Amino acid sequence: TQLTREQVLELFHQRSSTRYYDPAKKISDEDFECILECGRLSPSSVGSEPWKFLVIQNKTLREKMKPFSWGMINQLDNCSHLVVILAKKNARYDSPFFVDVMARKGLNAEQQQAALAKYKALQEEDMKLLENDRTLFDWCSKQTYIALANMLTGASALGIDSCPIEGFHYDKMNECLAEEGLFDPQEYAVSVAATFGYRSRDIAKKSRKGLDEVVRWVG
Amino acid sequence: SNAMTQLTREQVLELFHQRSSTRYYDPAKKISDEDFECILECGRLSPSSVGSEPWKFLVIQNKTLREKMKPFSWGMINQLDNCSHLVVILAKKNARYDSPFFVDVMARKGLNAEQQQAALAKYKALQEEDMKLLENDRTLFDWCSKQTYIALANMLTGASALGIDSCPIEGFHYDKMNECLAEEGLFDPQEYAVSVAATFGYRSRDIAKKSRKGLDEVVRWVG
Ligand SMILES: Cc1cc2nc3c(=O)[nH]c(=O)nc-3n(C[C@H](O)[C@H](O)[C@H](O)COP(=O)(O)O)c2cc1C
Ligand SMILES: Cc1cc2nc3c(=O)[nH]c(=O)nc-3n(C[C@H](O)[C@H](O)[C@H](O)COP(=O)(O)O)c2cc1C
Ligand SMILES: [Ca+2]
Ligand SMILES: [Cl-]
Ligand SMILES: [Cl-]
Ligand SMILES: [K+]
Ligand SMILES: [K+]
């Protein structure tokens, strides 16, 4: 339940992005389901959970992605698990996507009319997401980076290495995966990827800006 | 074991499951300076695309500034009175591969001149071709904004691990939030813009149990 400050900082300091995986070490089914749960339990704006997790274990599909996946060229051949996270397309307040969102919350008829009003104000005016489809997509995509973070941190807490991945051609990745029937490309598009496994070598800790530079205190 | 505590599967899940979005804070319970520093470090230490760390954390403790945000901050109107700490995360505007921002990124990594040139080529391909972030100013800002949701996520989890309640916040008027904070002189409006906020403190009331889509619904296994 509760950690000390030391335990929290040892966790976040020791987690590095791992590019060199031991191809002979596999994550147990039990450990990998725990990582997926960390993603599933993530918070999201208005409880939208606008994500899907493709676990790409197929070695033939891993090979096919390599030519346009320069960010994980080595990792695709050596990592235990690969997750491609999709974000919901056209998640408009007035879409059936939000019928499901409200159902899950158990809102009555009048509670739903109020919720639709709130969702519209958020999307149209407050955040101005309804400028174009890409701006609305990028909103769900941001939610999926919460899921990404939780999966990275959870894996690290279990003693499992990981790497978040943006280093691929998104258009060709979208075509590649949609052509495999892995999702409806009218409903979802690729957001971000992540590899999981066990380092093949020591991974040097990487630099950060100072807390003084990152934080502006407004007392 | 080692210098590091090794958590069980059950303890790791506990940490994510026990984190609920808190809207009702005890106004008499304040987060210690030390615990809140820890929370901020979880944000600082977050991963980011190409080590860009394109975030800035405004810690808004000023009660006059908090009350000024209320009229256009309907998603945390009551939290603004009762929460211990408030963090507004900015994302870098116009983080182009050729920008002074990326000179600083490469300077932190200790790249010599030849491997700076190779990094520039990588940044350029990612922004221009792979992710097509240079469509307009907003697509480029939204890429930095996505990095800041990792920092957000890790600060909620850090708070959770320390026994501290939190709420991620999007429920405010962004143009008005930007105007309010920039007119206060808290950042350069051409350099940064508001990405997302979060409240921190202690529950005054028992908060709702999780409602999520099943693992069956969200996971497609490709064996
Ligand atoms: C959204 C995201 C995408 C990333 N994409 C890649 C990638 O494609 N290839 C890679 O080798 N590292 C990738 N990284 C890892 C970052 O380079 C890394 O987080 C950064 O260099 C800081 O190092 P550290 O995470 O080990 O502390 C990515 C990180 C993030 C957050
Ligand atoms: C980016 C983001 C913004 C959110 N903004 C608000 C907010 O403005 N007000 C609020 O009460 N909750 C807000 N939430 C909390 C969500 O409603 C909550 O995460 C979701 O309903 C799931 O509930 P849980 O976090 O308690 O599991 C936000 C969540 C996220 C991830
Ligand atoms: Ca220790
Ligand atoms: Cl690689
Ligand atoms: Cl509130
Ligand atoms: K969307
Ligand atoms: K930017």
Author numbering:
A (entry chain A): 2 to 220
B (entry chain B): -2 to 220
Question: How did the manuscript describe this experimental structure?
Answer:
Phylogenetically diverse bacteria can carry out chloramphenicol reduction, but only a single enzyme has been described that efficiently catalyzes this reaction, the NfsB nitroreductase from Haemophilus influenzae strain KW20. We found that expression of H. influenzae and Neisseria spp. nfsB genes, but not Pasteurella multocida nfsB, allows Escherichia coli to resist chloramphenicol by nitroreduction. Mass spectrometric analysis confirmed that purified H. influenzae and N. meningitides NfsB enzymes reduce chloramphenicol to amino-chloramphenicol, while kinetics analyses supported the hypothesis that chloramphenicol reduction is a secondary activity. Previous kinetic studies of nitroreductase catalysis revealed that reactions progress by a double-displacement (ping-pong) mechanism that appears to lack the gating steps necessary to impose specificity, explaining the substrate promiscuity of these enzymes.
